[PDB]
């Protein structure tokens, strides 16, 4: 190794406690900056001038209610650079205008890109297959669709999600009230995939742990294993028979088992991402026209779908005034939908 | 000219047939309920 590229590759792809690699140059700075931006925004920067709230520990918020808030709706889809035509190089006023959210999001996306590249590079260095790198596409797609594509098809970063616990809860409740997101078949596939992945994880762990082989004399079975051993440590035949007699069907292929384990959550998350991409343009599966027409013609027809519709209407009407200060909605108390005595 | 040296035969076992049928019918259930409106 004599060339500049060769010596740089020799140092970068070295065997260390922390692997740097060629992708480290993109991953480490951006990831560090994103983490620092979140930790700074949740601790010192406020949200008074852009949302009308308080979102910092300095103002009296705990871990749940502290967040890095989004820019105001007047800024549209501006990238809000520190040197842009809005902040104009002022750091304090850049923080006050909501420029830390775009900072964190733009650095986090490149950190995700760098992390997938790092997975690819490490897999190639050890001479294995890049299925772990393929599996990260689902989280990356979820992040891209939720935080970039959905706001880009809306009024802007104000309706983008904020980086916090209670902020994410508000985002979820807004998605329920306005979009009827629970009634979306793509979201249904997503939740099915997530719950099935949890089921698969629990069932595989229990089945492997309860079909072990007697390789020791102690009740602590964790010490009867050696990673370099040849024979398998549990009885696939016994597991298959148990699950065939209990459930009806069972796995007989370890490779197929583990590929299914990989396949379920990735597909669920991708379907959810497609659903959110569709929702970005207000293309929401909100109502059933036949049910609405029947309920309109017949004042006796009621189902749970109509009750959900009424709940969504109440959510919208009572959250609109404070959630969207730019619309300047002043609502007299007698126009808000309300039930009897409640 | 000579027979194509890139000849392969596809296959599908009963487990794959059952999985495909189940996927088709579940998708049909969900999206038929949504398409009939």
């Amino acid at each position: 190794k004599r060339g500049w590229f060769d010596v740089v590759d020799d140092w970068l792809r070295r065997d260390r406690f922390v692997f740097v690699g060629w992708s480290g140059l993109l991953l480490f700075p951006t990831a560090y900056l994103a983490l620092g931006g979140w930790f700074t925004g949740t601790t010192f920067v406020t949200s008074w001038y852009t949302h009308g709230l308080a979102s910092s520990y300095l103002e009296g918020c705990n871990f749940l209610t502290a967040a890095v808030s989004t820019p105001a709706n007047s800024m549209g889809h501006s990238l809000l650079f520190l040197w842009g035509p809005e902040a104009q190089g002022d750091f304090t006023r850049w923080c006050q205008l909501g420029g830390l959210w775009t900072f964190v999001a733009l650095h986090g996306s490149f950190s995700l890109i760098g992390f997938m590249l790092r997975q690819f590079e490490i897999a190639r260095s050890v001479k294995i297959r890049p299925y772990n790198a393929i599996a990260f596409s689902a989280p990356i797609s979820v992040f891209v669709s939720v935080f970039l594509i959905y706001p880009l098809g809306q009024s802007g970063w104000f309706f983008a999600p904020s980086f916090g616990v209670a902020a994410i809860f508000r985002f979820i409740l807004f998605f329920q009230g306005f979009h009827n997101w629970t009634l979306n078949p793509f979201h249904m596939m997503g939740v099915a995939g997530v719950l099935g992945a949890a089921l698969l994880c629990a069932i595989h762990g229990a089945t492997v742990e309860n079909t072990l082989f007697e390789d020791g004399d102690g009740a602590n079975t964790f010490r009867a294993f050696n990673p370099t051993q040849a024979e398998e440590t549990y009885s696939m035949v016994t597991a298959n028979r148990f699950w065939s007699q209990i459930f009806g069907v069972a796995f007989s292929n370890k490779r197929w088992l583990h590929f299914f384990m990989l396949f379920v959550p990735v597909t669920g998350l991708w379907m959810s991402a497609i659903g959110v991409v569709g929702l970005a343009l207000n293309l929401r599966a909100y109502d059933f026209v036949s049910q609405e027409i029947r309920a309109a013609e017949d004042p006796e027809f009621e189902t749970f779908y109509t009750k959900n519709i009424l709940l969504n209407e109440g959510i919208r009407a009572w959250m609109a005034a404070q959630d969207q200060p730019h619309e300047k909605l002043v609502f007299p108390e007698e126009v808000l939908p309300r039930g009897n005595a409640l | 000219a000579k027979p194509n040296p890139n000849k392969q035969s596809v296959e599908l076992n009963r487990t794959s047939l059952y999985w495909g049928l189940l996927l088709i019918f579940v998708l049909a259930v969900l999206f038929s309920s949504y398409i009939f409106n």
Partner: peptide, 30 residues
């Protein structure tokens, strides 16, 4: 008209489940 389609879909799914359980390819130990 659509109720018939819904019932047919559900019945077909249940029949597929029954056939998958009781007409599976039996595992064979090598």
């Amino acid at each position: 008209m659509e109720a018939l389609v819904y019932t047919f879909l559900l019945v077909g799914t249940l029949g597929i489940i029954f056939f998958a359980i009781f007409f599976r390819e039996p595992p064979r130990i090598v």
